[PDB]
Amino acid sequence: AMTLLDGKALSAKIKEELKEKNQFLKSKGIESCLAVILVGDNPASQTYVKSKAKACEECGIKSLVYHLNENITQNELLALINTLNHDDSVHGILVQLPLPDHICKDLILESIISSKDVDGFHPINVGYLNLGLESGFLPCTPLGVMKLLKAYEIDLEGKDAVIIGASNIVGRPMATMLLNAGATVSVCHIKTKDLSLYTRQADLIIVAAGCVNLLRSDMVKEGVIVVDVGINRLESGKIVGDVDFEEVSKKSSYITPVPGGVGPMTIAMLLENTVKSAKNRL
Amino acid sequence: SNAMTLLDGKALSAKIKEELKEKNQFLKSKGIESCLAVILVGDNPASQTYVKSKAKACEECGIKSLVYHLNENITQNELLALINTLNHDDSVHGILVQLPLPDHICKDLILESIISSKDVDGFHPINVGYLNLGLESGFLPCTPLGVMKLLKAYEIDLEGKDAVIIGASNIVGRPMATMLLNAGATVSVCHIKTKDLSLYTRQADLIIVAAGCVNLLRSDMVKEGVIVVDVGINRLESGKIVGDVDFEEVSKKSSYITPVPGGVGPMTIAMLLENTVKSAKNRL
Numbered sequence: 224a225m226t227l228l229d230g231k232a233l234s235a236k237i238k239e240e241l242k243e244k245n246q247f248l249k250s251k252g253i254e255s256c257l258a259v260i261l262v263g264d265n266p267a268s269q270t271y272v273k274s275k276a277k278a279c280e281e282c283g284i285k286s287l288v289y290h291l292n293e294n295i296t297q298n299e300l301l302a303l304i305n306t307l308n309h310d311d312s313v314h315g316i317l318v319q320l321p322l323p324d325h326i327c328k329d330l331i332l333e334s335i336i337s338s339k340d341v342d343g344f345h346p347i348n349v350g351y352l353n354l355g356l357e358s359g360f361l362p363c364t365p366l367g368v369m370k371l372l373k374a375y376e377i378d379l380e381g382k383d384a385v386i387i388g389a390s391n392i393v394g395r396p397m398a399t400m401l402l403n404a405g406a407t408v409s410v411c412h413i414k415t416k417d418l419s420l421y422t423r424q425a426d427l428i429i430v431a432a433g434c435v436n437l438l439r440s441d442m443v444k445e446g447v448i449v450v451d452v453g454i455n456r457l458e459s460g461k462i463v464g465d466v467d468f469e470e471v472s473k474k475s476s477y478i479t480p481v482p483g484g485v486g487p488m489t490i491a492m493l494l495e496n497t498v499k500s501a502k503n504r505l
Numbered sequence: 506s507n508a509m510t511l512l513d514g515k516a517l518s519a520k521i522k523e524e525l526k527e528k529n530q531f532l533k534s535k536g537i538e539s540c541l542a543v544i545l546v547g548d549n550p551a552s553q554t555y556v557k558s559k560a561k562a563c564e565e566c567g568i569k570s571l572v573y574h575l576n577e578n579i580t581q582n583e584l585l586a587l588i589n590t591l592n593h594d595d596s597v598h599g600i601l602v603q604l605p606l607p608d609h610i611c612k613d614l615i616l617e618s619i620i621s622s623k624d625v626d627g628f629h630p631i632n633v634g635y636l637n638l639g640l641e642s643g644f645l646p647c648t649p650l651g652v653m654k655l656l657k658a659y660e661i662d663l664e665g666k667d668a669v670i671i672g673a674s675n676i677v678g679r680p681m682a683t684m685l686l687n688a689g690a691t692v693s694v695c696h697i698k699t700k701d702l703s704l705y706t707r708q709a710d711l712i713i714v715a716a717g718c719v720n721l722l723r724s725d726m727v728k729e730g731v732i733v734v735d736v737g738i739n740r741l742e743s744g745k746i747v748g749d750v751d752f753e754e755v756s757k758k759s760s761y762i763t764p765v766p767g768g769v770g771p772m773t774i775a776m777l778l779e780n781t782v783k784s785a786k787n788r789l
């Protein structure tokens with residue numbers, strides 16, 4: 224038949240657990256604290272951030288939200304991170320992506336102390352993951368996807384998996400986590416000649432491209448597992464994914480809704496990571 | 506169809522060593538004497554021979570080599586302390602541990618203990634991270650790097666291509682795939698758990714094979730005009746060394762193929778040398 228990969232329900236269960244954890248840390252002096260850094264007033268980024276803070280309060284995590292100017296300098300951005308780096312009351316530090324062009328994204332993410340790198344974008348944490356290690360912080364989206372799939376006991380060893388989209392935020396670590404899980408992985412992107420060739424033979428497809436209706440009924444096999452990471456806003460103001468959900472869901476054994484699939488899972492992983500960092504202080 | 510072309514890693518590496526030779530003559534005169542440290546734990550015959558050849562390629566091109574030959578049973582701590590000394594020695598530009606290490610020693614711990622600016626094998630987690638992020642400034646693992654140079658030397662366009670990497674190790678497969686993906690190729694990564702290899706190979710413009718399995722890639726798995734890179738090294742009973750590709754049949758359908766021996770091998774070595782001189786050169 225067909226079964227919804229419902230990250231909404233799943234994330235709620237996680238927040239409950241983190242509620243409990245923080246109470247305990249909070250008693251033992253450790254008040255779990257995420258510092259979020261927002262650059263410029265892009266209302267979409269502002270969206271992700273509001274939600275991020277709202278999630279934190281929901282489950283006893285102290286949010287620190289630095290909404291600073293779009294034009295602030297690299298050194299100012301850097302000096303804030305330095306301070307946060309050495310601020311024992313701060314357990315995670317996250318830069319909201321993307322950043323202004325005049326700023327070197329990599330230097331910035333690399334300058335966050337790797338033990339507070341809750342987004343998992345610091346080179347050494349990327350390295351750990353690509354090595355098959357769980358010795359660090361894993362990026363929240365790909366992590367949320369795995370936790371979700373693992374909740375539905377979807378076995379991954381040996382599957383034919385296709386990741387559509389090759390970004391550092393999603394695609395690449397997604398691929399690495401699948402491959403660490405024993406899956407065969409194909410990574411496709413804007414330059415892939417014929418995407419359908421990979422998608423038709425795929426047991427599992429992760430879509431993370433930023434293109435409305437990129438994945439269609441005639442590109443997927445009956446009983447495919449489809450995870451839709453994409454988030455797009457139409458004229459309607461209506462938020463949809465990269466997958467044509469109507470036509471593709473009829474053919475899927477399991478499939479993420481949008482919204483309510485990967486989104487809430489992303490947020491939940493950001494929370495788990497922040498608390499894992501807090502836990503270490505003990 | 507056009508004449509098949511041998512991806513001649515032996516000739517290219519000889520050209521590179523010659524370049525490295527001149528670079529070193531220049532660096533000597535600036536008081537920089539490129540120097541590489543190699544650590545060999547135990548008396549593995551294959552490891553031993555790999556080390557000799559590393560030292561010999563070093564001497565060839567004007568790189569001073571230091572070989573540390575340690576007991577099969579030495580402590581994780583003793584090895585860690587040695588690396589520590591080498592990390593701090595300003596006359597050493599490259600540090601390499603010969604793999605594999607004995608079972609009783611944590612490999613990841615060892616490789617991460619090497620200072621990342623002397624990590625000429627590119628196995629330090631931070632160097633693995635730079636690569637995965639798309640930065641090819643730092644240190645890149647030698648084998649997949651040598652594949653890329655070799656392909657580049659033959660002017661092989663990779664943007665948009667269908668590439669299959671067979672094997673998913675940290676030494677070869679995973680960095681190989683990242684570099685092809687960095688170059689704008691679509692990549693598929695297969696390994697021992699893949700259900701069906703021909704699913705991926707039949708469609709491939711480029712196949713990198715790196716599995717340690719004799720005849721893993723046969724002629725009926727590939728399409729006409731395919732480019733086949735053979736990283737494997739296997740010894741048959743007859744003492745002959747072959748790769749993982751069925752070269753005789755597969756080369757008949759290939760537009761470009763690496764022989765074994767003499768393809769990837771000398772390139773892996775040339776890249777360790779290049780990375781070592783890269784570190785030395787950085788001292789200016």
Ligand SMILES: NC(=O)c1ccc[n+]([C@@H]2O[C@H](COP(=O)([O-])OP(=O)(O)OC[C@H]3O[C@@H](n4cnc5c(N)ncnc54)[C@H](O)[C@@H]3O)[C@@H](O)[C@H]2O)c1
Pocket residue numbers: 271364387388389390391392393394411412413414415418431432433434437452453454455485486487489
């Ligand atoms: N908040 C969340 O839960 C969450 C977080 C991560 C990203 N997202 C969303 O998912 C999408 C992915 O984010 P990103 O940072 O990876 O974006 P990105 O633009 O940086 O990367 C896009 C990737 O998809 C590929 N691509 C684009 N169009 C394609 C096409 N028509 N065919 C094949 N490949 C194509 C690109 O080559 C690229 O590799 C975005 O729309 C983003 O809004 C959601």
Ligand SMILES: NC(=O)c1ccc[n+]([C@@H]2O[C@H](COP(=O)([O-])OP(=O)(O)OC[C@H]3O[C@@H](n4cnc5c(N)ncnc54)[C@H](O)[C@@H]3O)[C@@H](O)[C@H]2O)c1
Pocket residue numbers: 648671672673674675676677678695696697698699715716717718721736737738739769770773
């Ligand atoms: N020329 C050189 O100096 C040099 C350097 C690096 C490695 N190598 C050679 O490359 C080969 C692999 O090296 P490694 O370090 O990556 O070894 P490895 O054992 O760590 O990795 C093997 C990979 O290939 C896969 N594999 C094994 N058998 C397979 C099969 N039948 N079908 C599909 N996949 C299979 C494994 O699952 C694994 O992912 C070996 O022959 C090694 O000697 C050459």
